[PDB]
Nucleic acid binder design. Structure first.
Ligand SMILES: [Mg+2]
Ligand SMILES: [Mg+2]
Ligand SMILES: [Mg+2]
Ligand SMILES: [Mg+2]
Ligand SMILES: [Mg+2]
Ligand SMILES: [Mg+2]
Ligand SMILES: [Mg+2]
Ligand SMILES: [Mg+2]
Ligand SMILES: [Mg+2]
Ligand SMILES: [Mg+2]
Ligand SMILES: [Mg+2]
Ligand SMILES: [Mg+2]
Ligand SMILES: [Mg+2]
Ligand SMILES: [Mg+2]
Ligand SMILES: [Mg+2]
Ligand SMILES: [Mg+2]
Ligand SMILES: [Mg+2]
Ligand SMILES: [Mg+2]
Ligand SMILES: [Mg+2]
Ligand SMILES: [Mg+2]
Ligand SMILES: [Mg+2]
Ligand SMILES: [Mg+2]
Ligand SMILES: [Mg+2]
Ligand SMILES: [Mg+2]
Ligand SMILES: [Mg+2]
Ligand SMILES: [Mg+2]
Ligand SMILES: [Mg+2]
Ligand SMILES: [Mg+2]
Ligand SMILES: [Mg+2]
Ligand SMILES: [Mg+2]
Ligand SMILES: [Mg+2]
Ligand SMILES: [Mg+2]
Ligand SMILES: [Mg+2]
Ligand SMILES: [Mg+2]
Ligand SMILES: [Mg+2]
Ligand SMILES: [Mg+2]
Ligand SMILES: [Mg+2]
Ligand SMILES: [Mg+2]
Ligand SMILES: [Mg+2]
Lengths: 42, 273, 90
RNA sequence: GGUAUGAGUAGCGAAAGAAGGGUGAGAAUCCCUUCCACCGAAUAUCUAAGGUUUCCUGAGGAAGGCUCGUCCGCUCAGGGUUAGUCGGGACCUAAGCCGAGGCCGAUAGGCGUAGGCGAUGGACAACAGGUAGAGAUUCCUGUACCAGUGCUAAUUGUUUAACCGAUGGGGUGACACAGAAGGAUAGGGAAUCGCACGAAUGGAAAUGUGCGUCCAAGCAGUGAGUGUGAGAAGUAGGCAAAUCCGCUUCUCGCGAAGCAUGAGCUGUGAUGGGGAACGGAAGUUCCUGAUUUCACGCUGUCAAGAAAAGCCUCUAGGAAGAGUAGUACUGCCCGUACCGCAAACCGACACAGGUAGAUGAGGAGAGAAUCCUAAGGUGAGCGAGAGAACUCUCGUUAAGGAACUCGGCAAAAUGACCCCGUAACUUCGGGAGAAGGGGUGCUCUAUUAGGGUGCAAGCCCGAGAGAGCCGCAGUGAAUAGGCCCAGGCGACUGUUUAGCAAAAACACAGGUCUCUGCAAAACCGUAAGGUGACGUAUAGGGGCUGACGCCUGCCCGG
C-alpha cells in the first residue's frame, strides 16, 4: 500500500483553486505561481 | 443490587454489574432525547486537550430538569430509567398538566409516588424547595448555586448534602466532599440522597469495558522518554528522580493545592475538606 | 435563436442507419437543453418531435508532432419525430 | 555530453501445450479447428473508487512489447456513451467546514450566532422481452408507475365558510448488540414429460445414452405471520390556537375481533415472450432448502444504541374554485464508452505486492476447508536441446536414531470422525482434545430397524447387531493438534520499535496517594472561545502500583 491513494474530491478539496483562494496564504501561492507563469495553478 | 459474574473466562473473573432492578423501562421518552457526539477530549482547535477520552458506545442525551420550575403542580413518577450520561438513574415525571420531564432519581423514589416543587411542597424525598424553606439537618441534593440556574452541586449516584444553619441571606450546606460553604437561601435543592448508591461498588472487570465507557488507556510518566514527560528516561525502571512527582506539564502533582489563591468564592467557604 | 441551438447534422454509418426509424442526429450547442432542442427542431424543419435523447461527448486527445491537445467537446441530440410528422431530408 | 570495459556475459518477471489448416514478403509467437492442460469463495459474473478513450471498425509495423510479430492496451484515420423511474443535482440532514451582525486580537487574522454548505446515511415512480461492430432498466416492442398540465363531462361550493393549510404544535420518520425457532421463497437434486439417438472394442431396445423440462413489473385478489384494549367525557402543558398530542378520570375488556403492517402465493399481465430441434415440442410432481426475505419481528443483554427532510395530523391563517371520471399532452441538468483483485487503478515497468462491496454451482463434506469438476474464464509476450559440477525447490533411503548443533534449527511425526478412558493442581470456571487405548472398506439378511416430509402413492436420513468378501494398507487420495515433566517472568484477551527487537516492555481490571465546590481543577489558545461536561466529589485531572491471595514494618532529621 503506497503513499498516493487518489481521490478526485480530496485532491480538489485540499489543493484546488477554491481552497487556495479561501486563505491569504493560498492566494500567495496563486500569486507566486502566476508570477512564475505556471500553466497550471491549483 | 450488584451481581458477581462466575469466572467462566479470565475477562469475567472479578467483573461485577448493576442488576438494574430499580430500572422500570428500557425505552426512553422520545421527546426528551437530544443527539450527543463524542469529543474524545478535543478542543474547538481540534487538538487533544484532555487525555484518555475517546470511542465509547454511542449515546443520546436525555434533557434532565435540574431547575424544578413547575411549582404547585403535582408530578407523578412514571418510570425509573437508565441514563448513559450520568451515574444516577433518572425518573420520567408525568405532571398533571400533561408535561413530561426527567429528574435525577433520588434514593427511594418509586413509580406511583407524587413529587412536588416550590414553597408549599412537603419535606418528602423527590420534592424541590428553596433552601430558605428546607429545615436544618435535612439531607438534600441537586443544589443550585445561583437562583434559577438549576441544581449543579450534588447530582452523582449516592451523593448527599446536609443543611447545617442559616446566616443572613445564605444557608450553611455541608457538601458531599465534607466541605461546608454558604449557598444563597433563594437557591432550591431536592430532598434526599441521590440513589443508585451501589454504583461505586461496581468492578469494571476487563480492559474492554473501560473502552466501552469511552476511556482510552493511561500511559505512566515513568515509561516515557525525557522529551515526553518529566519522569521520562533512565536506564531500566527509575524512581521519581525529582524532588516531587510532576504532571506531564511540569507542576507538582502530590499535595500541591491548585485552587486559585485570591478566589472570589473564598468568602463563602466556611470549612475546607 | 434556434439555428444557434442546432449546429449541423451528424452523418455517420450509425446516424444514417436510424434515418428510416424517423430518428435524426444533430450536433447542438453544448449549453442547449433537450427542451430547447425539441422547440429548435420544430422551428427549423416544421416537424412534430416525439422525444429528444441527448449525450455529451468529451473532447478526444490528438497529437500532431510534439503538439498534443483536445478536439472540441460535443453535444449530440437524437430527435425522434412522431409517426404522422413530415421527414427531415439529409 | 559522447563512447568504451565488463560481454554476446547476467537477465528475459511464478504457469502446458500439440498438430493440422489458414493468412502473409516473412509465422514456436496472428486467425481457425481439434485434442490436451489450468482456475472454479476464482484466475468466473457484477458494482464502487481510480484511470480517462485504453472501447469499436479499417489500415500499419519505424519506435513501444524484455524474443518474434502478419498481432496489440502501440501508430494513423474514422466512429462509439441515448434515461421522468438507474446513480448524483433541481430534496434532507451527520461529522466537519463556512459564517451577516457579533466577541477577541500589533497587522495578518482567531473564534462564533442566525443562516448555509457538506454523504459514507434518510427520502424518492419500470419491468420483461428484442436488437447489436461499439450503449442499453437509457434505443425498439409490449405492459406499467410517479409528478404535473390543459381539454371535455357531469358533481358540488361560489362570504359564513366546499376546499387548501403553515416557515408554527404534535405523531411518525427513528435506528445498538447477541441469540433462538419458525413461514416463505432463491438455489440444489431426483423422477415426470418432451425431442433426438440406438451405438466404434466383449455386452446392452433399455431402470439405455444425450439435450431440454417457463416467464417480469404492474393490477386484482388473497396470505404464514407479526404487532397492537377500543370508546366517551374533562383539560395549570405543547410560546398564539388546536377537534391533534400529552395527562387524568369513568364506562366497556379482552384475549377474539376489528385496525395496522406482511414475506410469499393464485389469477391476470400472456392470442405475448422465450424454448430442444430452414424453424418450434414439453413446462408436471416430489425431495432438499438458505448466508435472501418476513424482520432487529420475537427473546434477552448493558455498553443503552444520528439528524433532518418526507409523510400523517392539528389548528393559526388563506379562500372560489375544488376534487372525481375520462381523454391527450408535459417531465430539465450531470454521469452512462472501456478496464476495474487489473497489462487500463496505487506500486518509475505489460512489476509474484496492494485495491471497498454484491453474486459465488456439484460430489464427498460441518464448511466459502479440501480434492476433482460445472457455468464461465485461462495456457501468462522468449524458445529448441541437454539431462555435468553447483545452487534452489522437491521425493525416497540400509543400519543407527539427536551421536548434529549455541540450540532437535530444519525436517519428520501428530492430525478427520466414532468408542473407551483421562492425573497433579485449582481462583471450582478449569486443567481437557490432558495423557493413554481401540475402531473406520465392500457385500448380504435391509421397501431397514426406527425416524423426517406425507390425506396416500412416493421421496429423503438409515442404526446397531449378525453372517460373509478383498487387500500390505480401508478418514486407502487431499485437507484437519505432536505430547509430557519441571522452573523463571508477566495474572489474563489486547499493544509495540511501518523496514534487524513482539518481549519479561506498554496497556489492563484492581489498589493507593493527591488535586478539584463548579466560570472546578487540569489542558489548548495572546485573547475571545473551547475541551473537561451538556458532567458536578460514587465526579473529573494528575502521580505511582498493576488480576487474585497473604501482607505492606521502622524513620518527618534532610
Ligand atoms: Mg503519482
Ligand atoms: Mg486520565
Ligand atoms: Mg522506553
Ligand atoms: Mg525535562
Ligand atoms: Mg537500575
Ligand atoms: Mg527519572
Ligand atoms: Mg443523459
Ligand atoms: Mg564472465
Ligand atoms: Mg555462464
Ligand atoms: Mg542463461
Ligand atoms: Mg514471462
Ligand atoms: Mg478454496
Ligand atoms: Mg481494442
Ligand atoms: Mg521486437
Ligand atoms: Mg494490427
Ligand atoms: Mg421508456
Ligand atoms: Mg453542525
Ligand atoms: Mg446550523
Ligand atoms: Mg446539499
Ligand atoms: Mg459493452
Ligand atoms: Mg430515537
Ligand atoms: Mg458499461
Ligand atoms: Mg500485477
Ligand atoms: Mg483488504
Ligand atoms: Mg468449460
Ligand atoms: Mg535411514
Ligand atoms: Mg529403516
Ligand atoms: Mg550433543
Ligand atoms: Mg542431551
Ligand atoms: Mg559435537
Ligand atoms: Mg551448549
Ligand atoms: Mg521446528
Ligand atoms: Mg487421508
Ligand atoms: Mg502478558
Ligand atoms: Mg522492526
Ligand atoms: Mg520481528
Ligand atoms: Mg473557557
Ligand atoms: Mg509496573
Ligand atoms: Mg490504575
Amino acid at each position: 500500500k503506497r503513499t498516493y491513494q487518489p481521490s478526485k474530491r480530496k485532491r480538489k478539496k485540499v489543493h484546488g483553486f477554491r481552497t487556495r483562494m479561501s486563505t491569504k496564504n493560498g492566494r500567495r501561492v496563486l500569486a507566486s505561481r502566476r508570477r512564475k507563469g505556471r500553466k497550471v495553478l491549483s | 443490587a450488584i451481581k458477581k459474574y462466575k469466572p467462566t473466562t479470565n475477562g469475567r473473573r472479578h467483573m461485577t454489574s448493576s442488576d438494574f432492578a430499580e430500572i422500570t423501562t428500557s425505552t426512553p421518552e422520545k421527546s426528551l432525547l437530544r443527539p450527543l457526539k463524542k469529543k474524545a477530549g478535543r478542543n474547538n482547535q481540534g487538538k487533544l486537550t484532555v487525555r484518555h477520552h475517546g470511542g465509547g458506545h454511542k449515546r443520546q442525551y436525555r434533557v434532565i430538569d435540574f431547575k424544578r420550575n413547575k411549582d404547585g403542580i403535582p408530578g407523578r413518577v412514571a418510570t425509573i430509567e437508565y441514563d448513559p450520561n450520568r451515574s444516577a438513574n433518572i425518573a420520567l415525571i408525568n405532571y398533571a398538566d400533561g408535561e413530561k420531564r426527567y429528574i435525577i432519581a433520588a434514593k427511594g423514589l418509586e413509580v406511583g409516588q407524587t413529587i412536588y416543587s416550590g414553597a408549599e411542597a412537603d419535606i418528602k424525598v423527590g420534592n424541590a424547595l428553596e433552601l430558605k424553606d428546607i429545615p436544618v439537618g435535612t439531607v438534600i441534593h441537586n443544589i443550585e448555586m445561583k437562583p434559577g440556574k438549576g441544581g449543579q452541586l450534588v447530582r452523582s449516584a449516592g451523593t448527599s448534602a446536609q443543611v447545617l444553619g442559616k446566616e443572613g441571606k445564605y444557608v450553611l450546606i455541608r457538601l458531599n466532599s465534607g466541605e461546608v460553604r454558604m449557598i444563597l437561601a433563594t437557591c432550591r435543592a431536592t430532598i434526599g440522597q441521590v440513589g443508585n448508591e451501589q454504583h461505586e461498588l461496581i468492578n469494571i472487570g476487563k480492559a474492554g469495558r473501560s473502552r466501552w465507557m469511552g476511556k482510552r488507556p493511561t500511559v505512566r510518566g515513568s515509561v516515557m522518554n525525557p522529551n515526553d514527560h518529566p519522569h521520562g528516561g533512565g536506564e531500566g525502571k527509575a524512581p521519581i528522580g525529582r524532588k516531587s512527582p510532576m504532571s506531564p506539564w511540569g507542576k507538582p502533582t502530590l499535595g500541591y493545592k491548585t485552587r486559585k489563591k485570591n478566589n472570589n468564592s473564598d468568602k463563602f467557604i466556611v470549612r475546607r475538606r | 435563436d434556434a439555428r444557434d441551438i442546432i449546429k449541423r447534422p451528424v452523418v455517420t454509418e450509425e446516424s444514417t442507419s436510424i434515418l428510416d426509424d424517423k430518428k435524426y442526429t444533430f450536433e447542438v450547442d453544448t449549453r442547449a437543453t433537450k427542451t430547447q432542442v425539441k422547440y429548435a427542431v420544430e422551428e427549423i424543419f416544421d416537424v412534430k418531435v416525439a422525444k429528444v435523447n441527448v449525450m455529451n461527448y468529451k473532447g478526444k486527445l490528438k497529437r500532431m508532432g510534439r503538439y498534443a491537445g483536445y478536439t472540441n467537446k460535443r453535444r449530440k441530440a437524437i430527435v425522434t419525430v412522431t409517426a404522422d410528422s413530415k421527414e427531415i431530408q439529409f
